Design an enzyme around this catalytic site. Structure first.
Site, PDB file in Angstrom:
ATOM      1  N   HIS A 126     -73.650 -19.820  28.938  1.00 23.93           N
ATOM      2  CA  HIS A 126     -74.419 -20.509  27.863  1.00 23.93           C
ATOM      3  C   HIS A 126     -75.023 -19.496  26.880  1.00 23.93           C
ATOM      4  CE1 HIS A 126     -76.556 -23.657  25.871  1.00 23.93           C
ATOM      5  NE2 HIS A 126     -77.757 -23.210  26.248  1.00 23.93           N
ATOM      6  N   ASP A 150     -69.481 -21.505  29.295  1.00 22.81           N
ATOM      7  CA  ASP A 150     -70.756 -22.265  29.252  1.00 22.81           C
ATOM      8  C   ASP A 150     -70.671 -23.413  30.265  1.00 22.81           C
ATOM      9  OD1 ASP A 150     -73.163 -23.541  28.644  1.00 22.81           O
ATOM     10  OD2 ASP A 150     -72.898 -23.349  26.467  1.00 22.81           O
ATOM     11  N   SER A 169     -79.487 -23.503  21.235  1.00 17.31           N
ATOM     12  CA  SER A 169     -79.134 -24.268  22.460  1.00 17.31           C
ATOM     13  C   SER A 169     -79.174 -25.775  22.149  1.00 17.31           C
ATOM     14  CB  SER A 169     -80.029 -23.864  23.604  1.00 17.31           C
ATOM     15  OG  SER A 169     -79.608 -24.471  24.815  1.00 17.31           O
TER      16      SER A 169
HETATM   17  O1  FLV Z   1     -80.498 -20.552  26.156  1.00 25.25           O
HETATM   18  C1  FLV Z   1     -81.409 -21.206  25.682  1.00 25.25           C
HETATM   19  C2  FLV Z   1     -81.818 -22.481  26.347  1.00 25.25           C
HETATM   20  O2  FLV Z   1     -81.239 -22.768  27.505  1.00 25.25           O
HETATM   21  C3  FLV Z   1     -82.738 -23.281  25.787  1.00 25.25           C
HETATM   22  C4  FLV Z   1     -83.385 -22.957  24.534  1.00 25.25           C
HETATM   23  O3  FLV Z   1     -84.166 -23.744  24.003  1.00 25.25           O
HETATM   24  C5  FLV Z   1     -83.110 -21.656  23.917  1.00 25.25           C
HETATM   25  C6  FLV Z   1     -83.807 -21.241  22.765  1.00 25.25           C
HETATM   26  O4  FLV Z   1     -84.738 -22.020  22.180  1.00 25.25           O
HETATM   27  C7  FLV Z   1     -83.548 -20.002  22.187  1.00 25.25           C
HETATM   28  C8  FLV Z   1     -82.599 -19.172  22.752  1.00 25.25           C
HETATM   29  O5  FLV Z   1     -82.351 -17.960  22.182  1.00 25.25           O
HETATM   30  C9  FLV Z   1     -81.901 -19.559  23.889  1.00 25.25           C
HETATM   31  C10 FLV Z   1     -82.150 -20.794  24.475  1.00 25.25           C
END
Ligand code: FLV
Length: 398
Positions: A378, A350, A255
């Site tokens: 997302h 997203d 992310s």
């Molecule tokens: O969707 C997110 C997200 O919105 C924030 C994140 O930090 C995250 C992450 O560290 C690991 C993930 O598999 C998914 C996310």
């Protein structure tokens, strides 16, 4: 204007409603023990969310939200202690990992780096202690190393706390490939259990480091150069570890981590075989037009305040006005050089960062690799997870 289309103007039904968030999405996510309730159990959360909904608590950033989780976390910690006393290591590990997830959700969406007395910082500290105790009981334990930040300059902190997990038999005679996970806005180094399982399962080491402006990352958030210095320190330490092969190393940006995976693909191209940028922003996510409606989309809570702090801004107003020209990998010209192999993974729809921030990278520097999931939001889970491990296998192949 945006590929997201009509959905860009949709005010999502969970906006400012913890009740709708739980009843529509998080209840089911929690049952399945999938993100953000990975390692978690519905037994632990059902009573907490019942409580929050009964009190009409909607603002995650409030102490009323955070402190509603801590009694459950305490009960699980005592249950774990009782399990350990009876030599039930598996049950103790499970209960402590469950406690870690209660803490994790309690400090969503963001631990404020500038407020060390905050209840969300307290919860994060308890989470790390509970998680390290849990993973200490694993056959291949997660170990914390405080890497000295030798490349630190200006406002950079001294210490880089990273998580390292090595597969059974990892030796200096035949050092194992490295998957370096770069975590995000609400996922920090304890939030990656299953990823480390899948990495070790394919005979690679898992290394997990937080990104600038989050958790325990010592990088100056307000200095766009700070991650370059951070990875110089991290990679220098891994070079020195006899059982880890930095000649066969891939980065995995999660992310908010995606930005730093894309950046590192360029800055550290001669030290990496590959990078995965999973739901990344790099340019258009900082467009004021995009930031005007980002809080209206799939992210569980208001994101703009957390983003302002993560980018090293004192106000959301200053962040919106300045962030793009300062941090955009396109505007600053980071994209106008070669990169190692770079896999770009996201949902086309997203609403947190635009799919345009993947597509833009095909107009600069080296060819990029991509898979974009039509209709998905997302990260594009769960579709985007299997292809991640397929690509790692191909890149880290013998
Ligand atoms: O969707 C997110 C997200 O919105 C924030 C994140 O930090 C995250 C992450 O560290 C690991 C993930 O598999 C998914 C996310």
């Amino acid at each position: 204007r945006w590929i997201l289309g009509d959905k860009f103007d949709t005010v999502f039904p969970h906006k400012g409603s913890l009740k709708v968030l739980w009843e529509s999405r998080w209840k089911f996510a929690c049952s399945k023990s999938v993100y953000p309730f990975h390692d978690g159990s519905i037994e632990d959360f059902e009573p907490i969310f019942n409580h929050l909904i009964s009190k009409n608590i909607n603002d995650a950033a409030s102490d009323e939200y955070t402190q509603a989780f801590l009694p459950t976390a305490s009960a699980l910690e005592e249950k774990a202690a009782q399990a350990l006393q009876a030599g039930k290591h598996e049950e103790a590990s499970n209960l402590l990992c469950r406690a870690a997830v209660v803490y994790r959700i309690s400090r969503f969406p963001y631990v404020d780096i500038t407020k060390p007395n905050s209840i969300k910082r307290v919860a994060f500290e308890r989470q790390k202690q509970a998680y390290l105790k849990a993973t200490s009981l694993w056959t291949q334990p997660i170990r914390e190393v405080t890497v000295p930040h030798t490349y630190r300059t200006g406002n950079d902190g001294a210490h880089i706390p990273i998580y390292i997990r090595t597969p059974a038999g990892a030796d200096q005679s035949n050092p194992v490939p490295i998957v370096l996970i770069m975590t995000g806005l609400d996922g920090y180094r304890p939030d990656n259990s299953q990823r480390t399982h899948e990495i070790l399962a394919r005979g690679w080491a898992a290394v997990v480091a937080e990104i600038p402006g989050t958790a325990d990352c010592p990088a100056d958030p307000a200095d766009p150069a700070s991650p370059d210095r951070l990875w110089d320190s991290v990679l220098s330490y891994l070079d020195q570890r006899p059982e880890l092969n930095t000649a066969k190393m891939v980065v995995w940006g999660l992310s908010a981590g995606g930005y730093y995976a894309i950046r590192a693909a360029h800055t550290h191209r001669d030290r990496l075989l590959g990078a995965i940028a999973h739901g990344p922003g790099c340019h258009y996510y900082l467009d004021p037009e995009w930031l005007a409606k980002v809080n209206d989309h799939e992210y569980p809570f208001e994101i703009t305040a957390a983003w302002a702090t993560k980018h090293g801004y004192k106000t959301v107003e200053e962040f919106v006005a300045g962030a793009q020209k300062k941090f955009s990998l396109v505007e600053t010209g980071i994209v106008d050089q070669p990169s190692c192999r770079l896999l770009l993974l996201n949902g086309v729809d997203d609403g947190v960062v635009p799919i345009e921030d993947c597509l833009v990278l095909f107009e600069h520097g080296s060819p990029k690799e991509g898979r974009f999931y039509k209709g998905l939001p997302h990260m594009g889970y769960p579709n985007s997870l299997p292809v991640s491990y397929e690509w790692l296998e191909q890149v880290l192949a013998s």
